[PDB]
From a paper:
To bypass this protective barrier, some phages encode polysaccharide-degrading enzymes referred to as depolymerases to provide access to cell surface receptors. Here, we characterized the structure and enzymatic activity of [name], showing it to be a capsule-degrading hydrolase specific for K2-type polysaccharides. Based largely on homology modeling, but supported by recent structural analyses, [name] RBPs are modular, comprising three functional domains: an N-terminal domain that tethers it to the phage baseplate or to other elements of the tail, a central β-helical domain that contains the enzymatic activity of the protein, and a C-terminal domain which may either act as an autochaperone or, in some cases, form a noncatalytic carbohydrate binding module. While the archetypal siphoviruses such as Lambda, T1, T5, and Chi use “L-shaped” or fibrous appendages on their tails to bind cell surface features, phage RAD2 has globular appendages comprised of the [name] RBP [name].
To investigate the mechanism by which the RBP capsule [name] functions, [name] was purified as an enzymatically active trimer and its structure solved at a resolution of 2.7 Å. Initial reconstructions using C1 symmetry revealed an elongated molecule of approximately 180 Å (18 nm) in length, consistent with the dimensions of the tail appendages measured in the initial TEM micrographs of the RAD2 virion. Three discernible domains of [name] could be observed: an N-terminal domain containing an extended triple helical bundle, a central beta-helical domain, and a distinct C-terminal domain. C3 symmetry was used to further refine the structure of [name] to 2.7 Å resolution. Residues 191 to 906 of [name] could be modeled within the electron density. However, due to the applied C3 symmetry, high-resolution structural information of the N-terminal triple helical bundle was lost. The central domain (residues 317 to 642) is formed by three parallel right-handed β-helices consisting of 10 rungs, with each helix of the trimer being formed by an individual monomer. Analysis of the surface properties of [name] revealed a prominent negatively charged cavity (yellow oval) located within the central β-helical domain at the interface between neighboring monomers. Adjacent grooves (yellow lines) were observed emanating from the cavity, which may facilitate binding to or funneling of substrates toward the active site. This cavity consists of a negatively charged triad (D543, E545, and D546) and two dyads (D399-E423 and D619-E620) within close proximity, suggesting that [name] may function as a hydrolase. However, structural differences were observed in the C-terminal domain of [name], which consists of a β-sandwich fold followed by a far C-terminal α-helical bundle.
Author numbering:
A (entry chain A), B (entry chain B): 455 to 906
Write the structure that this text describes.
């Protein structure tokens, strides 16, 4: 049941929440009776609460908590339709949870894990409101986890360019999770490459993600597998990696070889499957305060599997090869989409010169990509790996993309080379000795893909 | 200090700045005393001036100069926060500068070069206002250099689809320049492919630039250099170019070979490094009024350098091969992001059939890319070249992108060919003569990159 349409013009809600004084206060009536103002010691409030509405326009008002009242949010929108905000002043929130837990930068990590499905933790919490829009307000003094929280099937939201870095952890906190739900929202690019960015779920549902990032690694499985294989669910050639090897040569359907690594801050050896590339390369006549960093965030998308022991490692190195930062990622960590695949976020620290990424084994044995990362193809039969690089500035150092030229036929249409038909061995009865180099050259051609 | 939030509704500011009559006017007081109205002969004004505000909404008003008053702009926003415009009528501006210089179509080039940092030259001038929104209003009769001007760290702006071609030079004039600033704005795509487009700085900061354009040339330096190299800071091969050569076959790190050319309208020879491709290919049963042009603008991004005689040349040719238009681009011209790289804009004239682009030398000697275009790798240690083609219509002729097919393994995962191990020379003592054709094929395989 609902009412539509509700119109709000230049309306201000200020200071509306349980405060320190109100919780301990007792109202004395004219009949000399005392009434306890609080319902409980964990009483929490809000400035504006909306539920069961449609076509609500809040045009140029103000939502702020002055006097530090215990608020779970400034505006709570639940089960509404087409809630649009037009330049509302938002400021001075006192972050709390629904059960009365104070949101503080000290315990900001336990709030995201234990209170993900809670209706709290942002200046504006949107729950089950399809047509949401915020339209670039000015926000400041936000003492909670994020600025906007989206959850419970908010699938067509649009978020404008408000003040990026005001909350404690994020700017946009997408908490939508359900396999049946298809979320596709629009986020301003300036909110992604800021000091506080968006979480991995918000980047999963960001439709204009190529406006701020680009793919630095794109690998998928082939259609027809090679000769020594019993399937075509993983790569069989290793041609996309600089170090490492394959798990098996008699069954290529087993993926890459996962070698043991004790922790993510340990050095990678040539036996591990990993790549390496440099960033932020500027000359000697440039000051490091003028030349900023290249990459701000790195988003990795991979297949999802319930069990693990196979880790996707990523490291940020500097000059002299010292590890500045690292992180593990188990197969069950990619659950933006629980059934198929998910996203993870990695923060590139300032001063990093090189980036390493690959697959390792967290247990003390040698595993394979199929059995120890994909769980034997139980949740997905097509492996893929996508790594997005969110640049600090749009195109300062040049975005990384595959080479192409409209005037060169090798890149415009591709090269005109085909696999040669199989040539039999040289067994002429006219001379020996030369059959040494001929059959070896014919064998090298067949072994390197040039010949069938 | 500031006031927030200021609300404007259906408010009109009409014909306010100093006029011809007012400048020469003298007020006669009741006490028979005379007061000169004009402070100086170069008095200038605007309809609305805003400074030090936050969360300002101008909802459906009108800003117009009637009676031709001397105005630097219609609205001047300076050091504000979240200024949003909602469908405001804007019209009839008389372009002037802050010092009283009239902005006409004759001096439109000297004003852009000499008054870049001036707070003037547009219908709406935005200076140091992060959250600016324009919401696409209807605009006409604009006698300034541009319609919107952005400068002084306006880093997150959205510009809607207003009337494109009303100003004299541009639609959006981005004047943001600073090494520490990170600008990321959103511009409506219909404002980029218009008669008047956006300047090179606005395309630099345009995050949704792939919605209106596509890369027709993308080239970067490799990681590991070739054998005679002394470093890997430039392309060591010439596979991206159809003409020209390398500077020296003994170093390969000096880059391409820059040959002398008198002017940009001179014909390019096979000794020059340049490419060529055709545009607007329609059949005989199509009328040229129905078949429009293919490319509207071309944006080139390259590394910055403070000196050098090497020039990036681009030419627009026709049938019979006559040069319609051309332009030089020195290394200092790529300074839209001063310390690293920059953008330039080239206007493709109507009737053009072919486009040529490459690198030449403006001085009468043969130079190299490392020394005569870059300053010895003093600013950027990685060379890149990205050329964007802004199409007249979105996909009329088909956008140029690398070939791909999801059903072909050669394009889905790549070809399964590797460099063969080095095969020694055939020196068998059993027969000669054939060893000539054997070692010549083995030498060619090693020379063509097929063999190590």
């Amino acid at each position: 049941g609902h009412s539509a349409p509700v119109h709000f013009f230049n309306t201000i809600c200020n200071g509306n929440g349980p405060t320190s004084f109100a919780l301990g206060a007792t109202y004395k009536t004219t009949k000399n009776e005392y009434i306890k103002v609080m319902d409980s010691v964990n009483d929490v409030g809000c400035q504006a609460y909306f539920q069961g509405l449609s076509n609500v326009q809040y045009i140029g008002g103000q939502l702020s908590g002055h006097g530090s009242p215990r608020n779970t949010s400034l505006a709570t929108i639940t089960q509404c339709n087409s809630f649009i905000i037009y330049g509302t002043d938002l400021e001075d929130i006192n972050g709390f949870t629904t059960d009365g837990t104070a949101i503080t930068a000290d315990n900001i990590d336990a709030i995201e894990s234990n209170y993900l499905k809670d209706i709290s933790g942002a200046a504006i919490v949107v729950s089950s409101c399809p047509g949401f829009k915020i339209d670039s307000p000015h926000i400041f003094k936000i003492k909670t986890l994020s600025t906007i929280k989206l959850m419970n099937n908010t699938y067509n939201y649009e978020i404008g360019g408000f003040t990026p870095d005001e909350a404690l952890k994020y700017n946009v906190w997408d908490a939508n999770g359900l396999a049946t739900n298809r979320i596709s929202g629009v986020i301003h690019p300036r909110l992604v490459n800021s000091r506080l960015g968006i979480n991995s779920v918000a980047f999963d549902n960001m439709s204009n993600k190529l406006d701020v990032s680009s793919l630095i690694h794109n690998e998928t499985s082939q259609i027809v597998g090679l000769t020594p294989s019993t399937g075509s669910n993983v790569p069989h050639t290793r041609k996309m990696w600089s170090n490492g090897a394959m798990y098996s040569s008699t069954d290529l359907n087993n993926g890459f070889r996962l070698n043991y690594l004790s922790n993510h801050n340990e050095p990678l050896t040539p036996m591990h499957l990993y790549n390496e590339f440099s960033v932020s390369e500027f000359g000697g006549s440039v000051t490091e305060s003028n030349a900023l960093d290249e990459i701000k965030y790195i988003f990795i998308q991979t297949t999802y599997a319930n069990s693990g022991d196979g880790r996707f490692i990523i490291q940020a190195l500097d000059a002299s090869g010292s590890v500045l930062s690292s992180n593990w990622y188990s197969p069950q960590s990619f659950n933006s989409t629980f059934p198929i695949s998910g996203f993870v976020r990695f923060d590139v620290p300032t001063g990093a010169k090189k980036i390493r990424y690959g697959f390792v084994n967290s247990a003390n044995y040698t595993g394979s990509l199929r059995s120890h990362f994909m769980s034997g193809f139980a949740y997905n039969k097509r492996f893929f790996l996508k790594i997005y690089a969110v640049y600090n500035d749009l195109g300062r150092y040049g975005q990384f993309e595959p080479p192409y030229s409209v005037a060169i036929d090798r890149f415009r249409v591709g090269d005109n080379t085909t696999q040669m038909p199989s040539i039999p061995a040289s067994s002429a009865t006219d001379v020996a000795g030369v059959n040494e180099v001929i059959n070896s050259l014919l064998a090298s051609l067949k072994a390197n893909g040039f010949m069938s």
